[PDB]
Paper text:
Eukaryotic ribosome biogenesis is a complex, tightly regulated process that involves many ribosome biogenesis factors and spans different cellular compartments. Here, we answer these questions and reveal how the nascent 60S moves from chromatin to the late-assembly compartment in the nucleolus of Schizosaccharomyces pombe (S. pombe). In vitro, Fkbp39 binds DNA and nucleosomes but dissociates to bind nascent 60S particles and to partition them from chromatin through LLPS. This partitioning provides directionality for the nascent 60S to move into the nucleophosmin-rich GC, where its biogenesis continues.
To determine the assembly state(s) of the nascent ribosomes associated with Fkbp39 in vivo, we determined the cryo-EM structures of the particles pulled down with Fkbp39. We identified 4 major states of nascent 60S, and each state could be further classified into multiple substates. The nascent 60S associated with Fkbp39 represents early ribosome biogenesis stages. The structure of state 1 shows an early assembly intermediate with 23 ribosomal proteins and 19 biogenesis factors. This state incorporates the RNA domains I, II, and partially VI, indicating that Fkbp39 is recruited toward the end of transcription, consistent with its chromatin localization at the 25S rDNA region—notably, ITS2 is not cleaved. States 1 and 2 both resemble S. cerevisiae state C,33 except that ITS2 is cleaved in state 2, state 3 resembles state E, and state 4 is similar to state E with ITS2 processed. We did not observe clear density for Fkbp39 in the cryo-EM maps, suggesting that it binds nonspecifically to nascent 60S and, therefore, is conformationally disordered.
Residue numbers in the entry:
A (entry chain t): 64 to 249
B (entry chain o): 105 to 238
C (entry chain G): 52 to 237
D (entry chain K): 5 to 29, 52 to 266
E (entry chain m): 199 to 271, 293 to 296
RNA sequence: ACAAUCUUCUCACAUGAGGUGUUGAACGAAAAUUUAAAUUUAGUUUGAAAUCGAUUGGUGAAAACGGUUUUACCACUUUGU
């Protein structure tokens, strides 16, 4: 916690500039771990970033203000860029919106048209087209959608034996590796 | 009973000790002594428990026990040498006041005409004393 | 009960009910749990190279020589823990060892019964740790009997001067009268 | 001339050296400024250039070069500064081998002077510690980032030829001037050049912020070299 | 059942015990390895040992086994 | 997990400006400051050493009912975007 306190003030004081990997309207950020008895500013930022629990999956629009948040929890989260066809399968596999507050899967487009009818979204493909080419309804669709959960899969016999290991996740801007991490996510 | 465990790893708080000593029983008082003008701990922490028998049991657990590169010596001494100020200010967050920042607020301080007249009031008296020092 | 189990509990108790001489009495009082978890943490850097991956570095050493290159001119003197009973008796007589570790379960107990007496005479700080197999895991063996650090690099000298001070203060500084009286007869 | 509209040097300097001779049986320049010029305790020195070298060349220095250490170690021998720069210690080795507090206290006293590359000057505050970073032994930001003997020997000469100024949060600035064996003319010239550098990148308000400069020895009284007669008007300007 | 008579090992001996000098083979490269290297190095010239890069790349054409030889020479309402 | 993010330069320009970061304790100098108090503050010492000696100004963040207790580097850019 003293290391995180030093990491916060060092990155805040005289470090008010961000890297912000460009050429992407959206980014993929996942909290690969957590901090036991974390700072009050860290947990509130985790509540702000909607990654209240580790191994949660949600894509966020890339912005200068988002980059400030992307540099706030980078010690505890890993960022990157989302692939085109990977997100097409991610929504098809782990599309679980907060239907009436309950994280129910979007197994049919009728309920997708019922809730997102005001956003002119009736199908997942139309929702993905409003997500990849992020339109005005991208923020509202993510607001109605509960975040996905990318729990790392323990496949081999070593994955069940290692001491508190999760198939070796990394920290920072994975970029294409974030899509590779998504490729192994589901 | 009371104990004064020394050679603790630097940065260890009473919040850390009271979280650990409460697993041994009741932790009545605890004092992590620090530098008066700095506030950083002096690495000489004293803690008072409810029972001397429980405190004597804990001391048999932490007599020269290595913890993060230091053999932590913990021996519950008698209460005959215990004074009233042993637990002075216990269970209270210390105020490491930045007096330098206050002095920086003092050195660089807006003032009135008379407040500025008080600063240069003794400027000539100090110069006259130095004139007689030659 | 099977034919052998009723022996397997009785030789457990006849070591208790009889009069253990002070030479053997110290072989059951043993280094504790805590301070026997840092000794093996310091040793787990200085393991001998596994015989499979010593060859692996030898084929990588012998391939450049077959072209003209070399590394013997720049090879610094290696490090590891020193093991084997006959190699560690000569490392104590020559006053080269600095931390001798004695297993508490050597089956013919005469193999190590002179070591706590030899370490007391030659001034080599010593401790009796559990489970000969636990030493065996350190050096890639089935059952080790003893180990010894004779030279750690400059990295861990400051760590070693501290961890020995835990070994004398808990084993040698204590256990000072139970080694000087008979045991057993419980 | 530029400090307090007067050049009262080389006359009191001749008197102070005589006073040092008078009080026979180092000199620090205590200064009274307008306010706390130091915004914070800066754990770094200011390379004040002086014609008279107060750094004794008889002392030996150790340069904490960045890894790989085998490159600058040969360059230290290539520069022929073995008698000046004693031991080239790598940035990895200093952060790995010598880590105990007494060992650091021993490693501090094992050498005599210090040299540090500006490329790695910032990491010194944690690996070294207050055992070195508080016992009046601050690192010298040597500029050897190029990697040439011309860049090394010149920086080595600049290290031994120029004084260091450790700045921190304070309204009182002290300046170590030099030894008593220096000439009074050479000491006043070095003090005047120090004042030129002080008004450039040390004093926030320049010589106007410098109110009273009082020179003293290691144990002598602070004789005021120059006093700002218009400081009463400047005090009312700042404190308003 | 008396106490432990440590009449001899009470004190500490300060010297080493064996006095024969330190051999020269503890201050140089291990000449048993230098012989061992030359057995491997010779083996490369005769081509019986695949080398370290060959230790890597001959594992990579394998583990592709998906039917590389021919084995054969109610409805909706 | 006793693992962990303290700065092996940056930015401008080619000269600059920056690079915030250091056990404890004991020891002890003579000067300057700052606002009687504080600040800077020689030289020391020593095992990451220890057996009462705590100083007490200011900023607000959550529970609680405008008080109240909880932070164990919250410091003047002052405790939960």
């Amino acid at each position: 916690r003293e290391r995180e306190r030093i990491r916060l003030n060092r990155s805040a004081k005289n470090k008010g500039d961000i890297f912000v990997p460009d050429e992407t309207k959206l980014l993929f950020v996942i909290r690969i771990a957590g901090v036991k008895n974390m700072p009050p500013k860290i947990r509130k930022v985790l509540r702000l970033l909607r990654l209240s629990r580790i191994n949660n999956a949600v894509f966020v629009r890339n912005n200068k203000a988002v980059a400030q948040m992307l540099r706030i929890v980078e010690p505890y989260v890993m960022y990157g860029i989302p692939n085109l066809h990977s997100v097409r399968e991610l929504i098809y596999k782990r599309g679980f919106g907060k239907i009436n507050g309950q994280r129910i899967a979007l197994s049919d487009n009728a309920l997708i048209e019922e809730a997102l009818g005001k956003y002119d979204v009736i199908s997942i493909e139309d929702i993905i087209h409003e997500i990849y080419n992020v339109g005005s309804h991208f923020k509202e669709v993510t607001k109605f959608l509960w975040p996905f959960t990318l729990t790392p899969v323990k496949h081999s016999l070593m994955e069940k034996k290692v001491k508190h290991f999760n198939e070796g996740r990394k920290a920072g801007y994975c970029g294409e590796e974030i899509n590779e991490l998504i490729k192994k996510q589901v | 009973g009371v104990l004064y465990v020394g050679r603790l790893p630097h940065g260890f708080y009473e919040k850390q000790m009271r979280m650990y000593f409460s697993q041994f029983g009741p932790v009545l008082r605890l004092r992590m002594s620090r530098n008066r003008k700095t506030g950083s701990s002096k690495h000489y922490a004293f803690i008072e428990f409810e029972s001397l028998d429980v405190a004597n049991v804990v001391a048999e657990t932490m007599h020269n026990y290595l913890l993060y590169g230091k053999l932590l010596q913990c021996k519950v001494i008698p209460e005959d040498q215990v004074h009233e100020n042993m637990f002075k200010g216990a269970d209270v967050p210390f105020k490491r006041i930045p007096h330098a920042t206050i002095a920086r607020l003092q050195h660089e301080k807006p003032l009135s005409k008379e407040k500025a007249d008080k600063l240069i009031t003794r400027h000539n008296r100090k110069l006259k004393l130095k004139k007689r020092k030659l | 009960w099977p034919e052998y189990i009723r022996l397997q509990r009785r030789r457990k108790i006849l070591n208790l009910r009889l009069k253990v001489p002070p030479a053997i009495a110290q072989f059951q009082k043993t280094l504790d749990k805590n301070t026997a978890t840092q000794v093996f943490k310091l040793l787990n850097k200085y393991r001998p190279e596994t015989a499979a991956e010593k060859k692996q570095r030898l084929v990588a050493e012998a391939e450049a020589v077959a072209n003209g290159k070399s590394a013997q001119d720049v090879s610094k003197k290696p490090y590891n823990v020193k093991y084997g009973l006959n190699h560690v008796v000569a490392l104590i007589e020559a006053k080269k060892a600095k931390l001798v570790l004695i297993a508490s379960d050597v089956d013919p107990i005469e193999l190590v019964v002179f070591l706590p007496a030899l370490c007391k005479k030659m001034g080599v700080p010593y401790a009796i740790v559990k489970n000969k197999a636990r030493l065996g895991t350190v050096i890639h063996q089935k059952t080790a009997a003893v180990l010894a650090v004779t030279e750690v690099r400059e990295e861990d000298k400051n760590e070693l001067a501290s961890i020995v001070s835990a070994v004398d203060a808990n084993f040698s500084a204590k256990y000072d009268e139970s080694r000087r009286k008979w045991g057993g007869g419980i | 001339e530029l400090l307090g509209s007067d050049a009262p040097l080389e006359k009191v300097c001749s008197a102070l050296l005589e006073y040092e001779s008078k009080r026979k049986s180092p000199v620090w320049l205590q200064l009274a400024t307008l306010k706390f010029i130091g915004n914070n305790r800066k754990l770094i020195p200011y390379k004040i250039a002086i014609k008279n070298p107060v750094i004794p060349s008889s002392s030996e220095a150790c340069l904490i070069v960045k890894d790989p250490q085998r490159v600058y170690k040969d360059l230290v021998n290539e520069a022929g500064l073995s008698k000046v720069v004693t031991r080239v210690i790598g940035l990895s080795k200093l952060k790995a081998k010598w880590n105990s507090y007494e060992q650091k206290r021993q490693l501090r006293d094992q050498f005599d002077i210090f040299l540090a590359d500006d490329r790695v000057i910032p990491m010194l505050p944690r690996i070294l510690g207050k055992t070195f970073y508080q016992k009046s032994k601050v690192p010298v930001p040597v500029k050897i980032s190029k990697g040439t003997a011309e860049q090394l020997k010149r920086e080595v000469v600049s290290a031994y030829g120029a004084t260091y100024f450790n700045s921190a949060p304070c309204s009182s600035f002290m300046i170590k001037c030099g030894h008593v064996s220096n000439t009074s003319t050479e000491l006043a010239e070095n003090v005047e050049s120090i004042l030129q550098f002080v008004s450039k990148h040390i004093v926030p308000d320049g010589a106007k912020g410098i109110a009273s400069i009082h020179l003293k020895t290691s144990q002598s009284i602070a004789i005021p070299l120059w006093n700002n007669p218009n400081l009463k008007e400047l005090i009312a300007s700042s404190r308003k | 059942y008396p106490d432990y008579d440590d009449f001899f090992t009470n004190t500490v001996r300060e010297t080493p015990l064996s006095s024969a000098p330190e051999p020269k083979r503890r201050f140089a490269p291990s000449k048993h390895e230098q012989k061992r290297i030359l057995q491997l190095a010779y083996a490369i010239r005769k081509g019986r040992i695949l080398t370290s890069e060959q230790r890597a790349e001959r594992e990579r054409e394998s583990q592709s086994n998906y039917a590389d030889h021919d084995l054969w020479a109610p409805p909706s309402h």
